[PDB]
Amino acid sequence: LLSSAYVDSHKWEAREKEHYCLADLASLMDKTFERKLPVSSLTISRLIDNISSREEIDHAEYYLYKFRHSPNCWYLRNWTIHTWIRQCLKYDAQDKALYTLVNKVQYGIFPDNFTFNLLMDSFIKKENYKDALSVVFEVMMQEAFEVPSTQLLSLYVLFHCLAKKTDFSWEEERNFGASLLLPGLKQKNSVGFSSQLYGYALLGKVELQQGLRAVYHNMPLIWKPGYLDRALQVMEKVAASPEDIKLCREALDVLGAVLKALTSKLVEQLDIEETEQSKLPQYLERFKALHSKLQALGKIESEGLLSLTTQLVKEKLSTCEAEDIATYEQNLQQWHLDLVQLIQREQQQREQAKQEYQA
Amino acid sequence: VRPRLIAELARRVRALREQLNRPRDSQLYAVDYETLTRPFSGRRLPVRAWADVRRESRLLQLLGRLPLFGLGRLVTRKSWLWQHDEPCYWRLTRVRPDYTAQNLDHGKAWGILTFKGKTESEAREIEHVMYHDWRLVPKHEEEAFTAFTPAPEDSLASVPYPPLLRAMIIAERQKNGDTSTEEPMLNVQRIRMEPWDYPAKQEDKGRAKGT
Amino acid sequence: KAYRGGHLTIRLALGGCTNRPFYRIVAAHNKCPRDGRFVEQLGSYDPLPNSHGEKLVALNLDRIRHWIGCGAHLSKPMEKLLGLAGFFPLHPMMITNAERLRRKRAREVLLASQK
């Protein structure tokens, strides 16, 4: 979906690179780990920046793991992460980038939005929507939907993967609901509101069947009950909005199906408060009333979610990409300056240690 | 007095052994979830903690899955959520994980505390980082979570003296010639009732000794 | 003697004989034995009613105030005694125990009525 200009790697290929042989840096890091000393972020930066083969990708993975479990782990620089993902895409090792991204705790790979888009778009271009969905779930877990390009790509991938799915595991429902709610909350258009409703319906089903802790535990979601109430609130909001904003019939069908299926360990709630299971009948009545209201107002789209998201992408992705490319180039120059400063500081401290050792 | 040199030798070698065998957080605060015991010491956790130990997360179990270990993010506690209606949280400013941990799920953290809607001036170290009590506030919820309107906190400014002390004070006044009829009062606006679950100073707290 | 830490506390040291207790209110190091070394004797307390049907408590109020102002702690029985004297507020547990006793006697009266 992303243009050639966005995914172009020429500018990164032209970065100033100080050449090392990966074996030498690997041996230096192995000795430093033998002595239980801290490895600098410049060493790992140079090792990641001098990968020249698919086996060197495997070695760099191991040394990323070692650096993560070392004193200087949080000094892993953003240009290093970007270069890691670039090298993985370059040497046909996308499974390695996805592995380090999924196991981000063990490797410390926290990409910026440009890098998420690059990886997701590679997976999409090779029609591997399963791995693109995995990348979308990682974006959701890291709460990196702050850029419209990522939001649009994630929504496209999510609706593509939903259109061909019938059997839902509750973990899958939770992941899909969160991954659709988070980007949907940032899109003030028909697609965004439909995504909000669909995700709220899924999360409400999970809450009612498996409990609220199943919803919020290890998730970027709140611990407050009433997800179906929030779905109905989205419906009410759409009722009282400008004319342009509408709501997809498919999401409304999903919410209706969830309510129809729902109306057919520690206690975390106060006993003076009403449970959601006791509020399901009123939710169903409100859903029917609001559905009639939306039909009367003509606030319902007949177009499918996937087609609507396709049209929105072809309308907005180009401008999003232009803004992202400007930011990416600015970041590249800032990274160059930071790296030169780091190298100079490394030289200075090497000198100081040398005079101390001579004294 | 025959100088006791073996005592000095023993003290010095014991100190050296202690400083070269300092246990790490991953060892001190590991837990066996089946028996709910610390493998380091073999001591069982108190019963009232058991459920939370099996349900809630330690702070760095949350922070190790965030970029930059979650600086700037808001973290609250389950016990605070159950106890207080006003927002209570830490705004993280510094994190130092225990790198020896396999999942980087132990370590120390610093932040600015907001307790019951009242924020502190400076950042200090967070206590109970090793407790299975922590929750991460989603970024799309923070504005709703932090919303707090300071209610009028108008409490009593003075209390009566106890009966005998009041009588003695009045008697002393009357003996010294004063005939004032104003009731003696004890000033308590300066005594601020600090809740028992307010965070203490983690800097002053001790650490389990290696053994 | 030198102790590792500790503080002064105003407490009740038990003397008398078997079945005849008597208390001396003393300010003492908290690590010292109950009836051992003390800093000062601040009063006394006879828990047995005398021929006038009275329990006698002597309190050296000046010295009690002095030692509280010097950083001395108070044991719970001593706090309850001072609350009974009116020197302190009534301790929360005296009030709570009074309410518990009221409820128990009310239950007994209700049992009598039910029978």
């Binding site: 709630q269 106060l270 | 106890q83 | 009221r102 409820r103 009310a106």
Partner: peptide, 30 residues
């Protein structure tokens, strides 16, 4: 106590609760 605080206590001490006590008798029963 207000009912909300009592429900809060019942959640905190779930499974280890005694019967709630009402206000005491006004005076000591005889």
């Amino acid at each position: 106590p207000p009912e909300r605080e009592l429900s809060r206590l019942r959640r905190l001490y779930q499974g280890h609760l005694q019967e709630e006590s009402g206000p005491p008798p006004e005076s000591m029963p005889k």
